[PDB]
Write a protein that binds this ligand. Structure first.
Ligand code: 6HQ
Ligand code: CL
Length: 371
């Protein structure tokens, strides 16, 4: 089981695609809901995502069919298409997924934020970094629901530098476009969802706290955080969850005026990557870094909850730390940071000490020596 949110609000979930093209926005929205009797949200909603996971693993296509049998009926605790909780302006997080992931795989984070009164737009990237994604060739294809699938691109060593940088830049543009879409829906613009779903987007009119915007993301998504901040000053702060820094161009490092929080796993990080994080540091800039003891790269993603403790540890989905323990630390330290740099009037400052890594399961800064 993916955990329920720790906050006071019930959580809804829906999907939005606008426009219907490979250049439009695709996101999964998590939001405070008025109702708690809706069916739970299906975690991985299409067979092609399992085919794509199979390619990311470097296994045969039919392993996809096996992952689908294991995981294809699994839900996540958000009320599917529930009405939005009325009568409150909510801050907004745009969330960026890792390499091989897609929009639905960070629901433990998305639900937890939504239960505390955030609207969360988990983007699906069309840069071929997702295991799989889809869109429609034209208006006719959208109407009849004829999906076109786009699968993970494998790179040669020669393509690594250049293409990862092309992708992080597309990802940042995708974060900015998703923000503009939600802000336009907030400011009442009629948008016909390319997905025929029983959630009226009109509910979202006047529901966004328009200056209370943050960008969060994991791994490739954590580089997307940094690129997005350097390019779009509508985002007021960012949180990079175990950022993979390789995609960034040399130019971005000196160009991030916004507060930025690095939340790291113990076992992922390495000197080349830490040195790049430290290049984001300047005396005028607000920077924080914590490391979760006993944690692995995948502790930030939902697959840390999808298997048993022992198989989990073998597959590197789980660390020595308990997964609910680890994600609670990451989500609570995130909430305190967002409260600080978005100027929220909530009780999230109860977790201020976690930003400083002052907890038995936290390391202040990094365990990585860079000498
Ligand atoms: C770059 N990556 C990412 O974004 N997620 C992952 O698991 C790896 C490390 C492949
Ligand atoms: Cl790891």
């Amino acid at each position: 089981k993916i955990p329920r949110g720790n906050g006071p609000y019930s959580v809804g979930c829906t999907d939005l695609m606008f426009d219907h093209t490979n250049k439009g926005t695709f996101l999964r929205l998590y939001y405070p809901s008025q109702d708690n009797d809706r069916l739970d949200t299906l975690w991985i909603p299409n067979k092609e995502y399992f085919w794509g996971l199979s390619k990311f693993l470097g296994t045969h296509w039919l392993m996809g069919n096996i992952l689908r049998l294991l995981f294809g009926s699994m839900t996540t605790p958000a009320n599917w298409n529930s009405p939005l909780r009325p009568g409150e302006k909510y801050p907004l997080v745009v969330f960026s997924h890792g390499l091989g992931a897609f929009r639905t795989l960070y629901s433990a984070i998305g639900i937890d934020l939504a239960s505390h009164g955030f609207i969360v737009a988990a983007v699906e990237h069309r840069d071929r970094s997702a295991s799989a994604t889809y869109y429609f060739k034209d208006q006719s294809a959208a109407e009849i629901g004829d999906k076109s699938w786009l699968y993970l691109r494998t790179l040669k060593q020669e393509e690594e530098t250049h293409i990862r940088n092309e992708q992080v830049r597309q990802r940042a543009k995708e974060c900015s476009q998703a923000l503009s879409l939600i802000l336009d829906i907030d400011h009442g613009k009629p948008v016909k969802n390319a997905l025929d779903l029983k959630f009226d987007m009109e509910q979202l009119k006047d529901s966004i706290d328009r200056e209370k915007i943050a960008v969060i993301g994991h791994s490739f998504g954590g580089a997307t955080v940094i690129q997005t901040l350097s390019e779009d000053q509508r985002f007021r702060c960012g949180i990079a969850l175990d950022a993979w820094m390789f995609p960034l161009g040399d130019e971005v490092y000196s160009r991030i005026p916004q507060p930025l929080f690095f939340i790291n796993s113990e076992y992922f990080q390495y000197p080349a990557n830490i040195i790049k994080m430290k290049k984001c540091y300047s005396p005028d800039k607000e920077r924080k870094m914590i490391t979760i003891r006993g944690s692995v790269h995948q502790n930030f993603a939902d697959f840390t909850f999808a298997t048993g403790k022992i198989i989990g540890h073998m597959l590197k989905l789980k660390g020595d730390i308990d997964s609910n323990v680890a994600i609670d630390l990451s989500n609570k330290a995130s909430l305190a940071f967002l409260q600080k740099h978005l100027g929220l009037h909530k009780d999230f400052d109860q977790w201020d000490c976690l930003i400083e890594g002052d907890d038995e399961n936290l390391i202040p800064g990094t365990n990585i020596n860079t000498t």
